[PDB]
Amino acid sequence: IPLIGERFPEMEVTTDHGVIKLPDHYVSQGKWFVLFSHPADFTPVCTTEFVSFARRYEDFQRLGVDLIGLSVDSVFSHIKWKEWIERHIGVRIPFPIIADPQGTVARRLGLLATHTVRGVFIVDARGVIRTMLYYPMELGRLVDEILRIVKALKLGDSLKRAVPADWPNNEIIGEGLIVPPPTTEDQARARMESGQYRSLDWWFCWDTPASRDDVEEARRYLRRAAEKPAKLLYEEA
Template identity: 45%
Template sequence: MTDRDATPLTPRIGEPAPDFEAETTHGILRLEDFRESWLVLFSHPADFTPVCATELIAFAGAREKLRAMRCELLGLSVDSVFSHIAWVRSLESRFAVTIDFPLVADVTGEMARRYGMLMSAESPNEPVRMTYVIDDRGIVRAFSAYPMTTGRDVGEIVRLVAALQATDAHGVATPAGWKPGEPVLAPPPRTQAMAEERAKAGGAACPDWYFCKKETS
């Protein structure tokens, strides 16, 4: 395997997101341009392809929800900026959507390699469907990878951002399938005394010493 074929490890949860400076449909952008907001960075294999089209349409539909959560969108593929512009214009014309978030033209694949988006068993030069959630400090908080044949659930990405922000705001965890407004999970007790206190509380909200729900409002 040559150095050109080598793919860096995917940035891990809790690590700083790799810096970048990239040409996009909104001009040159850098990671630092998003430091005052959260960022969903997602890759797609290629412009003018059907699964990718459904994803961009879905992200456009979630744009206002994410914006209300101080979260920006940034797409990426190895297509040129001219291809991106033509594709966005086509999608907006054919599907009556507004795609007002930038798309990175990563023609050399450098940014895709830095984010571990290239997986040779899937494609030698097109990124898979990677999604990163990066917080307003530039830290990777979550990531996922889908194959080229399977579109992502954008609603789940919105839910994930909301759950991470609830964790930061309230110092809690969120249960499976949690949605904003629903009860969250209190951190488990760290001492025997705290466990005894939880056990005495009981009730539907606290069925066992390690499992207690609480409201955030």
């Protein structure tokens, strides 16, 4: 229920790494964070998602994005779940998980049976909610799309650009990035008279200010999403 563009609600949460204040803990560090929610511990979809996030941990870290889970179970159950994953899948889960018995945090976030406790909130270093994704409990997230979202948002912010559908493979403008549109007649006229940008109309101007490395990084996330793993973690268990 908190909307995109609103500050992440101020709250003290208990995690299996300790007690922290959101969004402050991350804002303090100049870090974005992705909070992802789960109905219960020892559940199979959420376990696959934990492992996906863990395998992408360095990619998130390189981008300056921390990860934090939320599940409606106790801190003790959380730690045992993480032990199970390291033992059986052989993947250590590096990020904290919020213990939310009573569902207090889930309720504060508008996510609450606990089946609906599934929201993902992507929060910037100013503490502002930038994107929210609600995949249901029967459907695993596509974690590489979360990396593409954070990368694209960060480029947008730093370049003062909006990002087209399917970027950096947009069908109209490709890796192009959109100039936020003029909001007055004089501004629109001036933009057109400048001949500064490629343009379809005064409200649809664009350029290509992203570096080749930034474009290639975002593309790599999508390529990874489309690629079948050569070896499956079930196999070497």
